[model samples]
Target: SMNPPPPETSNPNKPKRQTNQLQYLLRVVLKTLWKHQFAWPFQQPVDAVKLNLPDYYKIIKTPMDMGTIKKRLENNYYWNAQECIQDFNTMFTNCYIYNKPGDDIVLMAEALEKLFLQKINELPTEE
Candidate 1:
């Protein structure tokens, strides 16, 4: 008898569901900031607060104006371009292989993408 062929592997380029790599990166950034206490020595142990809707809109629309948010994300997270790309790749793989649309992972990915874009835009330009 002939041996059976192996099952087909999932497509690496196609996500099982759509994913927002940006969101995953953002979470990492925020978590890093929380770990570092937003850079205030006296505030060291305090938990980082979640952004309200208005704040979120403002930050996404005009990220440079939110200096504190930018500083904490950039300085505390240490998210260089390479790291961001790696994180996005990891999230894409996970989402493509496992996540379904509307699942928690997918939702998180969306949120992170928004955060990531804002953060990236906020970085200082070389002029």
Candidate 2:
């Protein structure tokens, strides 16, 4: 479970806003992971090779981001990594037999948490 580079480490000079962009991409990762429905027990690792971070960042800030944000603002709603306790349980059950079973679990873990607990360092860790 390698860390992603912290939010502070991303390019700070771009016109794009870091707060929104990071929030959006992290949202999309969770979306992709959950929506990526296959059989629960592993027959094989998903051929999700196209899950590139740069590609997602691009999609997120484009026209795609607003509809969801609009929906959230519509609701006064919020969510968190803490909300994902059941998600972890599901992963543990589904990926019970995969290679390096628990390693894939952190694919969308917030980078700050990775740094905070010394689970990762300040190095440019990427998934």
Candidate 3:
């Protein structure tokens, strides 16, 4: 005769199921952002030389963009959904910092930020 194993014995070390769900949600949200009309401005890193903004690189210490975020997501760089949201915030905030209040890029960033907030809010609240 044999005894049954404990519940803990069946638990995975990495919570694989939860990770899959989280990644799926992240991918959906990212694709939604990618489809937004304003996404083009934040699609890639700024061209400091071409744009004649020599101070662009200096002012923006850490650049963030959709392309970089997509690469990170595919590579499993984020351990949780919050990290992904934070990166989006970083990218938008960088635009706000680099551009003036009335600048076109800043306006686009504002629009995208609003949409992102709405999207993330729709996520399940269970921890």
Candidate 4:
């Protein structure tokens, strides 16, 4: 008879799948944060008017250079998002509008940035 699947655990022999799946799970949790923005239980700038406002969608939509942000996001999906290599360049650029939205939108931006920053923290760093 065929053998059953191996249990998911750490093993020095198969480090590839172990770390990859580990990182993948982190990505999964990160993705879940965008869902109505409630997945994050930390002190974020809460926006009851739009529960789903401070997400990657809003992040990409509001940027003056959205195309750049989207490209950076694709690159994040390609490389280790923790580093924020391309994404950082795009986000830190002067394209982001901080003064446009008085209080609510400012809070929205802060909350989303905080959300993404939290996800970046969850990503596994390479040794």
Best by TM-score: 3
Every model's TM-score: 0.32, 0.20, 0.76, 0.36
Candidate 4: Cα lDDT at 44: 28
Better of 1 and 2 by TM-score: 1
Cα lDDT tens digits, model 1, 61-84, are 211112233333344333244444
Error of model 4, residue 22, in angstroms:
11
For candidate 3, write residues 5-83 as lDDT tens digits: 2112132243323465356555667888888998987776666766777877677776778876776666556567776
lDDT of 4 at 108: 48
Query: How far out, in Å, is residue 60 in model 1?
Result: 31
Query: Tens-digit lDDT track for model 4 on 17-56?
Result: 2344235434553344345353332222223235544344
Off by over 4 Å in 1: 1-80
Model 2 clash pairs? none
Report clash pairs, candidate 3: none
**Residue 76 of model 2: what lDDT?**
29
lDDT of each: 0.37, 0.30, 0.70, 0.39
Better of 1 and 4 by TM-score: 4
Give the per-residue Cα lDDT of candidate 3 at 118: 80
- In model 1, what lDDT does residue 57 have? 28
lDDT per residue for candidate 2 within 6-103, as digits (tens), equals 21212334333223323433454333333333322122223233433333232222111222333332332334332232333333333333324335
Range of the 10 consecutive residues with the lowest summed lDDT in candidate 1 = 39-48
Put the candidates in TM-score order, highest first.
3, 4, 1, 2
Q: What is the C-alpha RMSD of each candidate to the true structure, in Å?
A: 17.7, 16.1, 13.7, 14.3
